[PDB]
Amino acid sequence: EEHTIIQAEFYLLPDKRGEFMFDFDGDEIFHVDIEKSETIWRLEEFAKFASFEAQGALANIAVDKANLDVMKERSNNTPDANVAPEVTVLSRSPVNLGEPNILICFIDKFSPPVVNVTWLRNGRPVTEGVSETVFLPRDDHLFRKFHYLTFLPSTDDFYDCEVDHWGLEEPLRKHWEFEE
């Protein structure tokens, strides 16, 4: 057996956002909804085999809230550069006209862990039939993140994944169209 169990958490600023989550062999097992103080399984099925007390994680984050204030003064002019993300868009499963599929917009190697992603269908903002994962950890100090969009394959329509990040000059835009 060769397995990995990662527990990642963090707090950001100015954004004032925190995260807490578990990873098993590169996949998310679940994370904790800071706001809603609840556990979110990455797959429904997972709930029936385990349980977690979210206030615990919230505690940790409070910890990290404070810690960050310390770290800011401790460094004195420590801030600096960031890491722009690499984006890739592709179909989740073989594409067959008429057969509903999913587009995956995969955001890689970046930090701080915060992005503005937008799905574009024929240049139009799609907000229905979309989903996203929290920020996932990598072997290093940067993050990864998935975005999804359900769609109906067509030979005449085109899609774009628009990602915005501090490390970007202007919004990034990955294109994707069907090909038989």
Instruction: Name the one range near other proteins by CB under 8 A: 18-26, 120-128, 152-160, 169-177.
Output: 18-26
Q: Which is nearer to other proteins, 147 or 160 (CB)?
A: 147
Asked whether position 170 contacts other proteins by CB under 8 A, the answer is no
Q: Which of 31, 84, 87, 94 touches other proteins (CB under 8 A)? A: 94
59 binds a copy of itself per the rule CB under 8 A: yes
Biggest CA pair distance of the chain: 58
Give the separation between CA 144 and CA 69, rounded to whole angstroms. Answer: 25
Q: Which of residues 101-160 bind other proteins (CB under 8 A)?
A: 104, 106, 111-114, 133, 136-137, 141-142, 146
Cβ(149)–Cβ(129) below 8 Å: yes
Kindly report the number of other CB atoms within 10 A of residue 113's CB atom.
Answer: 19
* Residue 91, CA atoms < 13 Å, CB-side half-sphere: 16
Residue ranges binding a copy of itself (CB under 8 A): 58-60, 62-63, 65-66
